[PDB]
Enzyme design. Sequence first.
Site, PDB file in Angstrom:
ATOM      1  N   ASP A   2       3.388 -25.095 -14.037  1.00 60.84           N
ATOM      2  CA  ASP A   2       2.485 -25.491 -12.968  1.00 60.84           C
ATOM      3  C   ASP A   2       3.144 -26.240 -11.801  1.00 60.84           C
ATOM      4  OD1 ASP A   2      -0.409 -25.582 -12.056  1.00 60.84           O
ATOM      5  OD2 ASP A   2       0.024 -27.735 -12.121  1.00 60.84           O
ATOM      6  N   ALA A   3       3.984 -27.231 -12.098  1.00 66.18           N
ATOM      7  CA  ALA A   3       4.634 -27.992 -11.035  1.00 66.18           C
ATOM      8  C   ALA A   3       5.441 -27.075 -10.121  1.00 66.18           C
ATOM      9  CB  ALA A   3       5.538 -29.071 -11.627  1.00 66.18           C
ATOM     10  N   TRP A  58      -0.961  -4.377 -10.976  1.00 67.09           N
ATOM     11  CA  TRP A  58      -0.878  -3.328 -11.989  1.00 67.09           C
ATOM     12  C   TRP A  58      -0.717  -3.802 -13.461  1.00 67.09           C
ATOM     13  CZ3 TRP A  58      -2.183   1.515 -12.156  1.00 67.09           C
ATOM     14  CH2 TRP A  58      -1.738   2.288 -13.254  1.00 67.09           C
ATOM     15  N   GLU A  85      -6.784  -2.765 -10.240  1.00 66.11           N
ATOM     16  CA  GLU A  85      -6.397  -1.364 -10.086  1.00 66.11           C
ATOM     17  C   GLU A  85      -6.713  -0.534 -11.321  1.00 66.11           C
ATOM     18  OE1 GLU A  85      -2.170  -1.578  -9.212  1.00 66.11           O
ATOM     19  OE2 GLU A  85      -2.464  -3.263  -7.836  1.00 66.11           O
ATOM     20  N   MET A  92      -3.935   0.718  -0.226  1.00 70.82           N
ATOM     21  CA  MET A  92      -2.586   0.881  -0.744  1.00 70.82           C
ATOM     22  C   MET A  92      -2.134   2.284  -0.382  1.00 70.82           C
ATOM     23  SD  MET A  92      -3.306  -1.041  -4.442  1.00 70.82           S
ATOM     24  CE  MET A  92      -1.758  -0.519  -5.114  1.00 70.82           C
ATOM     25  N   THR A  93      -1.999   2.524   0.922  1.00 71.74           N
ATOM     26  CA  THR A  93      -1.608   3.845   1.407  1.00 71.74           C
ATOM     27  C   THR A  93      -0.103   4.126   1.305  1.00 71.74           C
ATOM     28  OG1 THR A  93      -2.140   2.778   3.536  1.00 71.74           O
ATOM     29  CG2 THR A  93      -3.513   4.616   2.849  1.00 71.74           C
ATOM     30  N   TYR A  94       0.362   4.181   0.063  1.00 70.78           N
ATOM     31  CA  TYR A  94       1.746   4.472  -0.301  1.00 70.78           C
ATOM     32  C   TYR A  94       1.700   4.842  -1.787  1.00 70.78           C
ATOM     33  CZ  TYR A  94       0.946  -0.641  -0.634  1.00 70.78           C
ATOM     34  OH  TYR A  94       0.452  -1.900  -0.825  1.00 70.78           O
TER      35      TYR A  94
END
Lengths: 496, 497, 5, 5
Positions: B66-67, B95, B142, B210-212
């Site tokens: 966390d730190a 993903w 996704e 996510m056009t790739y």
Amino acid sequence: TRKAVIGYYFIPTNQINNYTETDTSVVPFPVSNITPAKAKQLTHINFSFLDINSNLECAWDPATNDAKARDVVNRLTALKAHNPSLRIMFSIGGWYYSNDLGVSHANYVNAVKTPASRTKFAQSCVRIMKDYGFDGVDIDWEYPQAAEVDGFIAALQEIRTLLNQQTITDGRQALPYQLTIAGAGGAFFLSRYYSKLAQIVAPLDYINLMTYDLAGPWEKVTNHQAALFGDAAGPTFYNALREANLGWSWEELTRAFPSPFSLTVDAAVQQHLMMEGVPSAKIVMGVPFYGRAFKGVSGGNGGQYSSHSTPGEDPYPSTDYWLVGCEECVRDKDPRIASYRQLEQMLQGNYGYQRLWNDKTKTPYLYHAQNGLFVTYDDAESFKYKAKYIKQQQLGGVMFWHLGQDNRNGDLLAALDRYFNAADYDDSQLDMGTGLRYTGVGPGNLPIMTAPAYVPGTTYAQGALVSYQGYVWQTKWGYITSAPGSDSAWLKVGRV
Amino acid sequence: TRKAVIGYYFIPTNQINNYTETDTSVVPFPVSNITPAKAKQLTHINFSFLDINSNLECAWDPATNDAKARDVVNRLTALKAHNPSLRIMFSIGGWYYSNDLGVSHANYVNAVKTPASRTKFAQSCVRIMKDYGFDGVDIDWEYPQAAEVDGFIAALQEIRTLLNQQTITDGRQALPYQLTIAGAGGAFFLSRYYSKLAQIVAPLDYINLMTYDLAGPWEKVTNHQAALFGDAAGPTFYNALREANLGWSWEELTRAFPSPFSLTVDAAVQQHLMMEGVPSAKIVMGVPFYGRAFKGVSGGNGGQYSSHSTPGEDPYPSTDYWLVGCEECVRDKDPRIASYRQLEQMLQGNYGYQRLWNDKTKTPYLYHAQNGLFVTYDDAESFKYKAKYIKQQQLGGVMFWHLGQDNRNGDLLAALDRYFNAADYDDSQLDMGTGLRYTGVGPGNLPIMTAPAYVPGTTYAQGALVSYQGYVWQTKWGYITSAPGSDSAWLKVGRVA
Amino acid sequence: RXSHX
Amino acid sequence: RXSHX
């Protein structure tokens, strides 16, 4: 179980109001023509047509002489003495009354509109039935549209509830009151209510498909009006059912409704069978006892598939009766339709007609080279194939329009009864031909298949088959990680 | 209004726990690479990725120190001192966490199931946001499917209400907390929730497409992963959207979804625009800051559209790092993907790569003749066409995966900012080319049309056109006696002005 | 898979 | 039209 043999008995208001059994010029086919022999060949006689009035109740045409009407109906029910299984039904509707632009169309739309209108209408049908002595109700609305379908369905369910109660109240267990409707036998009109077929048929004993008039003067080229199977050389049509409100995917719509396709009896039957919840036993195949005539056709192929100059308008907008040798046509003022009886006499005379046969469609046709005429019709021979089809497809039986069109010897009717019932008739070797079969596949007629049970957590490649919740499913593309029914990547392709 | 420029800043729990700004070997792209200049070029930074735990709440990977996490976040939020409009968003999902077979998938599905679960989840999102100093929430599931969509939609709405309320409470009217999601850029995954796009987007400030990854090891033929327009010579695909639960007729599905079609950026964008209620201003086009590598390719056409022997399984099965020159690949043990930074060095190192250009797709690619290699990637030149497309189609802006993959000078980021904002950059004459355009027409993007009003009681022929109840309809066959909208003989083809 | 996916 | 229809 016995196949149904349903004959429509149509009689105009003028003929009822002037009923006689001794003058064919006024009443061409009086009830007396239906002998005990013929009465035994039928299972149902559909008295036609009654209507729905502005008070949204079932009723006789306003011009009908009720006393004469009762007497005609009584002569018909009298036939039950000769055939304990015979039912005299009554039909509400028909083209003139119920088509979109027909005289009472609104009443139909209105009568099924509300729970209250439906109850009043349902009550009136049962009331008419009991008051005149009929054995059931047939509804011939041509045809309810998408927005009227739910109402139509509810009215049928109501009538079914009432008939069932009446059957018990009258101790009619041996011959229960029935409910049927005349259904469209062509994709275009069928598209109107096709999506709710299962619901429409549930309350019925039978849906009588009007598998005829699949060709008419409104069509571009002459064609067979009731071809059993398709003739690759004949015209094809747009498959209107791919546009019904089914909610199926493109894949689904596409495999069930090839377009274009051949407008045939087989197409109509299969299209009904493709719908889940529509049992084959309730499907009755209609056949015509009349032929449709076209003029101005080009010789060359018996007159099939030719342009013509037949007025497609209704009524017939002329006094020109070009169907040579058809006195009936002059009498009824229309050379576009002729009863099998008249047609037979036309062939009997010289008149220059030749009877040809199409071995793909398995139907006959007349051609008049001298005047360029073409007549599409059916006969005892085409009926052999249709009868065999009905048995193979386990349909409920046959229906026809209409009894008054058979020859005096009742040959067409005798043929139908013979093919279903004669102990000495055997069609096991009857050659069904190579005519085109409808290739559509839908939810209600999926092939039986086997496949590994779907396994949750598995990734499937494209084309994979699995069994899940009763059906066999196939992936439409690869890398499928979801379950059949939850992922639109699965196509239901088989059952069990 | 300024175009959004959203850069993902992805850092593995491991790099967070060992964060350092003086050892490329441990942390390849520390926050310190983002100078005040680069910071001014971004409108948003999507810190990635947080998750949803079994308690159905938003949370950091359990193995996170966390730190060290706060330290990393502070370094990002500090960038705000150089750009008042910069927002540091955090993304939930990704993903590994949210794909169907991901470790945390069940948590996403269960968190959105009920009003109670949705409320608790949303509350946790806003709580994480305020606790670490984030400026908004981005969800990268996704992807939601079937029965999950309504819950997902209701969850976004629940987050939207809490964010707005928190905006007021904090007097953040000058820089309101935002909500966005990463959406699929390809039809296959898009079909999962396509039919409800309008409902999904309504509560969002933006949907980042996510056009790739439109090409990948999993495909049989090599192809550009982010073609702007289609190439007739390239592979085509069945248009999965026609299998979406839309309720359209056969004619409607066919018109809206030509198939086979070219899997391109333009297709994804137009597919979103076709749906009524989906505003172009909320659409953000994603572009890749990396390339995808293929091996075993044939020659003749620069390695384009060729079979190949590239393993598609994930993780990379083999140990064969066949991408010549890519040291990044060895480090990360996968020769299938390389950052733009690395690709540039590969070109510079004379390892046998030829940089080629496809004027239809408007994208670059590398071809290695000696070893039979093919690489599809994006660069400052391909961005010129995409930037103009974004402006022309009036989209909300650009998003990219990911910041850590730009070269040390930040040339890719600088080019995107330049094309939207530089006074001395002029693309009015940039030729968009003759590549294939997606031309589907859905009942949600019908053209303005004119036709005689429908006349009840009339019989219409096939192909007739009539105006009726706000639309123009055409008959699919003849002898039509029914009213449009009714039965199925009428096809809706236009809108009544 | 491999990147964002 | 002409018959049943």
